Amino acid sequence: FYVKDHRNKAMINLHIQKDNPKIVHAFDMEDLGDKAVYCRCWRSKKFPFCDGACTKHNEETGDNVGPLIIKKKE
Amino acid sequence: RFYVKDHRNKAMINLHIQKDNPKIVHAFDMEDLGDKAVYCRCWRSKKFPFCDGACTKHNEETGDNVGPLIIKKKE
Numbered sequence: 001f002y003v004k005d006h007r008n009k010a011m012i013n014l015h016i017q018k019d020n021p022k023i024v025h026a027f028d029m030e031d032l033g034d035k036a037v038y039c040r041c042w043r044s045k046k047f048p049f050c051d052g053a054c055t056k057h058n059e060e061t062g063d064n065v066g067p068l069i070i071k072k073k074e
Numbered sequence: 075r076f077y078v079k080d081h082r083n084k085a086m087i088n089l090h091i092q093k094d095n096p097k098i099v100h101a102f103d104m105e106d107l108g109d110k111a112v113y114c115r116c117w118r119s120k121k122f123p124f125c126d127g128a129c130t131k132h133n134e135e136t137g138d139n140v141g142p143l144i145i146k147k148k149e
């Protein structure tokens with residue numbers, strides 16, 4: 001059994017700051033702690049920070065996304 | 075007088091990037107960063123984990139409002 005398609009255009013961000021036409025975050029590395037973990041799935045309730053929402057998203061959708069970690073060499 | 079705007083979906087976010095990796099995580103030491111690093115949050119960049127402007131076309135096509143994460147040196 002085969003099948004065709006069309007133009008769905010699913011959004012990545014479903015609910016965060018929808019009054020902002022393009023969500024961009026900018027941080028000075030000098031004011032970060034020893035570690036910051038940033039969300040790349042747009043499902044975190046602590047956006048722009050990762051709260052572990054990625055896990056449920058990957059399990060539900062079969063995806064493989066995860067966060068960006070900025071840290072001091074240590 | 076009441077109506078909702080439903081945007082919920084069960085679609086994957088990352089369509090094509092490093093699918094042999096079960097969970098794509100990047101970790102960088104700030105001491106090794108230059109003046110400005112711009113990281114992709116849309117999973118459409120051909121330079122992932124870095125932003126290449128793919129988010130603009132995604133936003134246009136889908137009506138989305140995603141954009142990158144910038145880590146920079148204080149001015």
Ligand code: FES
Nearest residue numbers: 039040041050053
């Ligand atoms: S909560 Fe989104 S990448 Fe972890």
Ligand code: FES
Nearest residue numbers: 114115116125128
């Ligand atoms: S290319 Fe993905 S956020 Fe810019």
